Enzyme design. Sequence first.
Site, short mmCIF file in Angstrom:
data_model
loop_
_atom_site.label_atom_id
_atom_site.label_comp_id
_atom_site.label_asym_id
_atom_site.label_seq_id
_atom_site.Cartn_x
_atom_site.Cartn_y
_atom_site.Cartn_z
N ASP A 97 0.77 -1.16 -0.02
CA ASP A 97 0.08 -0.13 0.11
C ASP A 97 0.87 1.23 -0.03
OD1 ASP A 97 -2.87 1.05 2.00
OD2 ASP A 97 -2.57 1.47 -0.22
N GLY A 196 -9.29 9.18 6.06
CA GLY A 196 -8.89 10.38 5.60
C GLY A 196 -7.47 10.86 5.89
#
Length: 246
Positions: A97, A196
């Site tokens: 990732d 977020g």
Amino acid sequence: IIGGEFTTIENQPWFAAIYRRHRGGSVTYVCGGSLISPCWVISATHCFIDYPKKEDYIVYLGRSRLNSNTQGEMKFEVENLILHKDYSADTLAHHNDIALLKIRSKEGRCAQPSRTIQTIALPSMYNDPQFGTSCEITGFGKEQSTDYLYPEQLKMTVVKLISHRECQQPHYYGSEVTTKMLCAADPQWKTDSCQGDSGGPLVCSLQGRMTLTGIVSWGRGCALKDKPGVYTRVSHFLPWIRSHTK
Ligand SMILES: N=C(N)c1ccc2cc(C(=O)Nc3ccccc3)ccc2c1
């Protein structure tokens, strides 16, 4: 960021604020990132995989508020969006990732370092901090899991690194968390990264050097008991970062 404190960009000058342009002209916040060299921001592939058009992204450096044009900030478009070719997502765990965004101003320039725009050093191989070390995270992510809005002012917090053996305990993440991931959390489970904050930095001071040890990747809920924040272990990806920035 759940808990923590409000801050400003002069305290986290490597922090990149990444937004996406929608059809119709609306712009929304996507994820954080970190400036590793003037032309290169590093973030998380899961932030971009479903909308892989580089043209849609806006990157800010030197920005302290979600909806203010901070004095000294710089706005960029993405010249090259590099997603990890072996990125994948399981129910909880995200693998490889990590993403690179080559940034360019409308004049074709990279970042100009200043008091509020600075790079963050990469880690060295096989030399991450020991478990129990305090590191900081920064981001515009949710203040509470039940929120749908993100905070207007940038936040930071401090969490402690958790060992791989502790993070693989049954009540933690078991075998879902791997040696290419680093866990970090609050021992009292009151502060953490959240939705977020992905892509943003986990910065550790190691041997007197502020270092980009991790990248916010995943977690079960936010600030949940026995559910640490999970971070891409940047030191594993030094060959990939070097090859993709050459
Ligand atoms: N508990 C945390 N530290 C943490 C970290 C990252 C997170 C990311 C998401 C998230 O929304 N990830 C995502 C978004 C879109 C596509 C794929 C993954 C949600 C909760 C998190 C909690």
